[PDB]
Symmetry: D2
Subunit: 287 residues, 4 copies
């Protein structure tokens, strides 16, 4: 009977931006995939078609390119600017969500204006403003890692549906998808992203894994213990199975050398490693 | 300082299952992409690498195929069975999240056992168990729609970043991604899905649009009003932009006929339509 | 040593076009992804950087939309026009390749101007011009089909690496990708596309398959036998394996009901079925 | 009336192999996606369903793994071993096409058995045997490059559909996709791959481009002049358009700094650069 408009947001998603810094002959490249969405009072827009409060998504796109013209130090900075502009620029706009993907480029032979893309990982950033409160989550995705040894899995329960054999030597392969929430905007965004990345990789490589979960925990622990500006870090790590091929039918053995890299299905292990006493479920995670 | 383990879950993702029904010569097909993840006490598995609590993801995969053997009336029914099995079968497992994509097949000229894949839409379902509670959210995705007219957009604010021209006749195209949460598990799942799908299309096509937000609202309102077992319905609708090409430079006009369908960027209108006073904060929306 | 500029072609690829026909209240939609490349004397363009001969890819893009304004009866007739224009309007352009994908849309409850996409198959067409010569290849792709029975595979050689067991009852699933070359341009393009599709689907469904090879041969046989204007039909059919899951370790049998649809690897069976005597290697298959 | 079986081939596509070298503590990783297809006399398999000649695609897959056990020095060497084994092992198999994608891994902090995937490019190899002849084409793809200046495009034709503005300074970005054919199987496959990669990158960056066509020519020329074992190199380069946004409506100028990276459409520039006197159109290019 009584229908009501609940949570809502809207804007321009995936605005591809490339900003070249060419004040000197040594060109700089900044590449982002930006998404802007606003939150506020849009009751009439949905219920009556009254667009008085609707700052056009096209306009939000236009603002991204306009602000880019002034350049930005980091991705978070750029997002911070867009957020303040929209929330303060309009009364009915109480907040919103601004995200971006940062694509890495390397110079070709240290060239002044020639680069090639580094597709090994994608950096992300999300900004969420709610009234007077702000929150930034930085992250990394698409970084694939693998250990040829130094990994085992055994001691798990065995029901009538269990056929997996225990092991003390296997391959551990996953894609690093991690996201950490800063407990303050005053952060050296580039330095911390670099550090977090290094910590994750090191923990993955040096930890003798008894389970992907254990490895993930150690990766998460290293970050929290190292950075006071981070309250928590979430990770979604798939266990990309590399099955040891059975060659015995052909009278050949396989000493952990020949594997079949299966696509699907795959284990999916996820968890949140936080600083004891930090907020439990921040809104930024709701998206 | 003190690193703690927060929310966490694990299982086997994307188990592709095809169940054929052939007790009679008239074969039936059920094609699913199943995901199983468990929640409970996995404290030791993460901090000590003690897997006594770790029901193998491989075992979960096996349980899916074993259960499929007995058949299932609906996708939601199949998931409820998997959920009940793991929560009740292990004391440290107090809940989980079981999801699936259902793919549709049509008979080739009414043949008894030959079919063709209907890729126009993908059906979804996600079951979340929290102790005694079992929440189910069904959905639809990949259903692309378009109105060649009967859509306008005007009356929006115009700041210094606004260039968009108002219009009373444009194309409105989007990908229908809708998801709805049932307030009860006693639902005729297949019939409700078919009904919701029809209400969504009808509303999109018959609503004279003043904005994508108004269309979406009318789409959601229709569903909430028709089905009492539905508390809320969320939609994420991209505004797939079809730009009327400027042919004047070629000496021709363009009476809303020739369009350029842009990939990115795109508007992204999202909202939750619901029964007044319902729990628009359910955890299942956290994933 | 000496370097020689060999085969070459250039143009604008993937120009997304949507043509709405709204003369009556009942609108019609034509959706295409068009690619236009030119061939001719571009020696100086590559070797010297002289663009005198380079009809801009941008210009080619504009021509596609300008021509769209006048409407077109079929996708093939649109390409024919595009090709004649470029070869005839420039002395240095001696030919080229014009391709297009055609996406289908269905009305939402027989509505005058509201539709939903039918993604179950994508229609294709390729036109190649070489001086006075002109050839057209029409095709279909992305059409997934599956037989739950009426498929066998036995009698193959058992070499020292063969573990596959003979079977007289299995699932046969594939993606139908078929392309046929017309011996003349005077064809009811739409009627023939409808027919071929119907013949392929029928041949796939009704043929008691002893091998994907046999099935594919019959599919192409029906096409050549039914249409005199077609000289040959090429098919590329993956054998999308659906493995009958072994449930015996769980104390269950599996009467051809529970399957695991694997992603990779997959059998890839391909072949050309042609009219006796027709050409062996038309340049149009060279791309 | 009379239908005949023309060209044909079949086998197992996309066999994911990971070969770990660990006879020492310093592990090595070889990661490939292998496709195996046979050519010969399969007339009966297609026409009558007689599989006596059909070496199962499943067997071909098994062979890939059995062979991997022994190890291989290079992707091309491994392909040659497969090609030779099948053609010689069966009388009715007179040739085939073996293809492979090689994915690269980097040690994590020079660790012995922990790596991270380098996704900035994918290496390719195609071996085609025809009787006593065996041709090998190696390649690179997925390598994205960009010049922020040092590129222009002017002097092109202008007709009624020409609107592109001439420029003396623009962004030149593309996806480097290249394939070169060897004139002999006696090559240091890995050294040449690296050499060619560097030459393409160097020619792209340093050449002051007057058109993508010219840049590509210089890239091909450098490779041919440098390596005697290469008869020709083919390149397929899209012109990834980065449009200089019009910021004047916002009260700003845009001195070649803020760009919009469009997805589609895109220019597609392709050409073959070969050693003078070399073969015109080798069959391997037809696949
Ligand atoms: O690390 C792992 N965690 C799991 O939960 C699991 N299940 N199977 N293999 C596994 N590996
Ligand atoms: O339907 C629309 N809603 C919006 O909010 C919008 N902004 N630009 N175009 C738009 N179209
Ligand atoms: O480099 C280019 N080559 C072309 O042929 C072209 N056409 N438009 N822009 C172009 N740029
Ligand atoms: O129909 C088939 N053809 C083949 O070539 C094959 N190989 N394995 N199974 C097969 N089935």
């Amino acid at each position: 009977t009584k229908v009501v408009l609940g949570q809502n947001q809207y804007g321009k998603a995936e605005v591809r931006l490339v900003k070249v810094t060419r004040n000197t002959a040594r060109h700089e490249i900044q590449d982002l995939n930006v998404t802007s969405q606003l939150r506020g009072d849009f009751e009439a827009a949905h219920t009556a078609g009254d667009n008085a409060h609707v700052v056009a998504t096209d306009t939000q796109k236009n603002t991204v390119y306009a602000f880019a013209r002034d350049g930005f130090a980091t991705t978070e900075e750029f997002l911070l600017r867009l957020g303040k502009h929209f929330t303060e620029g309009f009364d009915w706009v109480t907040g919103g969500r601004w995200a971006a993907q940062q694509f890495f480029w390397d110079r070709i032979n240290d060239h002044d204006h020639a680069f090639s893309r580094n597709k090994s990982e994608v950096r992300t950033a999300v900004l969420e403003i709610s009234g007077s409160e702000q929150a930034i989550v930085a992250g990394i995705e698409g970084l694939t890692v693998l250990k040829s040894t130094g990994s085992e899995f055994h001691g798990f329960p065995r029901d009538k549906y269990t056929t997996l054999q225990e092991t003390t030597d296997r391959i551990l392969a996953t894609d690093v998808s991690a996201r950490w929430r800063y407990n303050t905007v005053e952060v050296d965004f580039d330095a911390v992203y670099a550090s977090v990345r290094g910590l994750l990789l090191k923990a993955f490589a040096e930890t003798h894994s008894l389970a992907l979960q254990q490895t993930m925990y150690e990766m998460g622990r290293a970050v929290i213990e190292t950075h006071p500006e981070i309250d928590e870090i979430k990770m979604s790590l798939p266990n990309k199975h590399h099955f040891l091929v059975d060659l015995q039918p052909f009278g050949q053995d396989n000493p952990n050398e020949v594997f079949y890299a299966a696509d699907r299905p795959y284990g999916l292990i996820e968890a949140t490693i936080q600083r004891e006493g930090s907020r439990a479920d921040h809104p930024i995670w709701s998206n």
